[PDB]
Amino acid sequence: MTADLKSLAKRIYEAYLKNFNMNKVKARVILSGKASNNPPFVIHDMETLCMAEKTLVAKLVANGIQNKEAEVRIFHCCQCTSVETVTELTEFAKAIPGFANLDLNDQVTLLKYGVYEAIFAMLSSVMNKDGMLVAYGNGFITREFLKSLRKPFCDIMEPKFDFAMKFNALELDDSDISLFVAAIICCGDRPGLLNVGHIEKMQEGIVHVLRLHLQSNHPDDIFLFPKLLQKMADLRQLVTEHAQLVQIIKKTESDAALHPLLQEIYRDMY
Numbered sequence: 001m002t003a004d005l006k007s008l009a010k011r012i013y014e015a016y017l018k019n020f021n022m023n024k025v026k027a028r029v030i031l032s033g034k035a036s037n038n039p040p041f042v043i044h045d046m047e048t049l050c051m052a053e054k055t056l057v058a059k060l061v062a063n064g065i066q067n068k069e070a071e072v073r074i075f076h077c078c079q080c081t082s083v084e085t086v087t088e089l090t091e092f093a094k095a096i097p098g099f100a101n102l103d104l105n106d107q108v109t110l111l112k113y114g115v116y117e118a119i120f121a122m123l124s125s126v127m128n129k130d131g132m133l134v135a136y137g138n139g140f141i142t143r144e145f146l147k148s149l150r151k152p153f154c155d156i157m158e159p160k161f162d163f164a165m166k167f168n169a170l171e172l173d174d175s176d177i178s179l180f181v182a183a184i185i186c187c188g189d190r191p192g193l194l195n196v197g198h199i200e201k202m203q204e205g206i207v208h209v210l211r212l213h214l215q216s217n218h219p220d221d222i223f224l225f226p227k228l229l230q231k232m233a234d235l236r237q238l239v240t241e242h243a244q245l246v247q248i249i250k251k252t253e254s255d256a257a258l259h260p261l262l263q264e265i266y267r268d269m270y
Ligand SMILES: *c1ccc([N+](=O)[O-])cc1C(=O)Nc1ccccc1
Pocket: 056, 059, 060, 061, 063, 065, 076, 077, 079, 080, 257, 258, 259, 260
């Protein structure tokens, strides 16, 4: 591995830690309970939910949702998390050598289709077999509780849990995930791209640094890179299935509005 590539990776790594407050290392120390005797508040039923919701009683009232069904409240708070992560990814993309120089429309297109593939990828970092950290690591909503919600809301997170478990089995660190997320955004296959040639050249570089980094960082996992390539395909499919379930929810649930920023992303996605 050369020096220009070795720096390009650290640069990507740098932008990852600067723009994402909840990295895998922060989460893994919380979940282990080895650096603090004060665990996060656990949400496992409607009771503990209403207790945690009393913390954000201000924004629930502002958004006129404080009185709606419990499933819809979670669906609304989670949209906020997506908006934040989409924003953070928009800033993270600037550190991708060549992304800032692409035409503006192609930047919107790359993010329009990649953000949710990146979200579900990074979402694995805050997940275990029993639940996921929430509110910057101050809460832990249980997997079973999300399954107990009424359909179709109970079908939202479970596939993400299933993906995170298999994804976490690869035992990647933020060093690897950062490059992995960069490759997800720099995909020359996105419908609507104008300068496909430039983006593809930009992707070949990212994917190259990733393949070398994986060999350097995980030498005893010979086919870790092929495994990831298959993980990109699984994420793409996972997002498709997710977008299908959202359109089913937005139409057959007149009570669960859709955030304006996310409406654009989901609009004419596939
Ligand atoms: C963001 C943070 C917290 C809450 N909450 O707890 O009520 C809600 C939101 C939010 O963005 N709600 C929303 C959903 C859809 C359209 C506009 C606003």
